[PDB]
Antibody, heavy 219, light 213 residues
Framework: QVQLVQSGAEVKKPGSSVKVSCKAS????????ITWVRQAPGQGLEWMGGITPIFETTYAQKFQGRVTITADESTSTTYMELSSLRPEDTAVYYC???????????????????WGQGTLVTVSSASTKGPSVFPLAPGGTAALGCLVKDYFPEPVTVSWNSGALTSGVHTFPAVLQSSGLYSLSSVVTVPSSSLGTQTYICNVNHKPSNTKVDKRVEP | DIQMTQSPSSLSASVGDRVTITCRAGQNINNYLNWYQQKPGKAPKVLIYAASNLQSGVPSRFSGSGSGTDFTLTISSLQPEDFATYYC?????????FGQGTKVEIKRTVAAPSVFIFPPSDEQLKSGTASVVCLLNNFYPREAKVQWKVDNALQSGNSQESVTEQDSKDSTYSLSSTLTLSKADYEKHKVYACEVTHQGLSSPVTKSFNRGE
């Protein structure tokens, strides 16, 4: 099953250009109909443009030439470049395959599947900054967690024990502090009898700053 | 170019209810119409193709109909995991276009929060700042009042909240409240308390600790 993997999140200064990559692997074809869609925070999906298996491009007029999709067949990679960035361009950028998946009634039907994992592009002149990670230390049910403070830009991901612990986890949406930096907590409820026996580690990843931190949370 | 108009922009219904969402195209698009489901933090997933066909693996409570300009997505018996935003998308023209989306929210019975308080870590205090964290876990409805008291002094303007999206299994929310102080100010007081008011609690619940103790 083909899978699409995108480049990581980054902050870009207003006026600059961003280039997001989409790498395909695992399918049977050498090139695909790739489309690009974006989603600004709290907004809908907005289609941007697409490229065919023989590298013909189509762009929504609304972008006014600011979007360019190119292909590198040697690496099975598609690039979307969005130029003259303004803060309204802050959004998750998605690639997807938009291939013909079904024909019936004399017609053929395209749809988006699979999707890339998305790339959050933050348009801002603030600098990247990695997070500090502090523990939220814990009869019946206990709560424990990790406080992930003072990073920029979004996003941060948090897992517990590498993702082996998912039940009872709540990773809160980030909040923008008045310092201009983001903060967030991830918590998990566990049996209180497990404390001091079971190890709990939060894995914090801020790809924009290449920060991968683990924090053991003990009582 | 082909404008899609989706309505309503949001709805809420109880488990088991029938839910209907509408998509209107600005021009005839025959049956070149897809519906996607997007859950929080995820890419959208196709549910319906060619207006009325279920993607394999999708439960049969979903259906679609329409040909021409008017299309509907129907959930015959809403389930908690159906909490999501739904989008229509036309594939008639090479320039693809999306409807604005419909957010589907789940009504459930009242559930009281479990309340937890966390003092700042000794590591954070070395850096000069104290974060005190109050957790409200697995409650419904989302409306809740969280008040910080320091030595029984009601705090104002020094805390921020975060609230999760509805849980895909039990349709509850969780919320955090973070009180942020200087190390200096934090060490001038002893009692740290967050007090919680919620429809599922007969009287407010207070969790507190004493600095150091």
């Amino acid at each position: 099953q083909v899978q699409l993997v995108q480049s990581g999140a980054e902050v870009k200064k207003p006026g600059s250009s961003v280039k997001v990559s989409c790498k395909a692997s695992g399918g049977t074809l050498n090139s695909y109909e790739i489309t690009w869609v974006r989603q600004a925070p709290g907004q809908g999906l907005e289609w941007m443009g697409g490229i065919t298996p023989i590298f013909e491009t189509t762009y929504a007029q609304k972008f006014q030439g600011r979007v360019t999709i190119t292909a590198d067949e040697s690496t099975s990679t598609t690039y979307m470049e969005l130029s003259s960035l303004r803060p309204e361009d802050t959004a998750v950028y998605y690639c997807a395959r938009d291939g013909v998946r079904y024909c019936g009634g004399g017609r053929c039907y395209n749809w988006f599947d699979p999707w890339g994992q998305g790339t959050l592009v933050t348009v801002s002149s603030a600098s990247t900054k990695g997070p500090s990670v502090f523990p939220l230390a814990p009869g019946g049910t206990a709560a424990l967690g990790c406080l992930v403070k003072d990073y920029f830009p979004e996003p941060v991901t948090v897992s517990w024990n590498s993702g082996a612990l998912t039940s009872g986890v709540h990773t809160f949406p980030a909040v923008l502090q008045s310092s201009g930096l983001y903060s967030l907590s991830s918590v998990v409820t566990v049996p209180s009898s497990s404390l001091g026996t079971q190890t709990y580690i939060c894995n914090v990843n801020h790809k924009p700053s290449n920060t991968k931190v683990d924090k053991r949370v003990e009582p | 170019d082909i404008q899609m108009t989706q309505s309503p922009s949001s709805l809420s219904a109880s488990v088991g209810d029938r839910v209907t969402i509408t998509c209107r195209a600005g021009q005839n698009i025959n049956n070149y119409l897809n519906w996607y489901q997007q859950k929080p933090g995820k890419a959208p997933k196709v549910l319906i193709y060619a207006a009325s066909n279920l993607q394999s693996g999708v439960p049969s409570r979903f259906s679609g109909s329409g040909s021409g300009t008017d299309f509907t997505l129907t959930i015959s018996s809403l389930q908690p995991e159906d909490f999501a935003t739904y989008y229509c998308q036309q594939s008639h023209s090479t320039v693809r276009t999306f409807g604005q989306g419909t957010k589907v929210e789940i009504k459930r019975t009242v559930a009281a929060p479990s309340v937890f308080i966390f003092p700042p870590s000794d590591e954070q205090l070395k850096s000069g700042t104290a974060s005190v964290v109050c957790l409200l876990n697995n409650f419904y409805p989302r409306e809740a009042k969280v008040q910080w008291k320091v030595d029984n002094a009601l705090q104002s303007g020094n805390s921020q909240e975060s609230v999760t999206e509805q849980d895909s299994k039990d349709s509850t929310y969780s919320l955090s409240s973070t009180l942020t102080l200087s190390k200096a100010d934090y060490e001038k007081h002893k009692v740290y308390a967050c007090e919680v008011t919620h429809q599922g609690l007969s009287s407010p619940v207070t969790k507190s600790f004493n600095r150091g103790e």
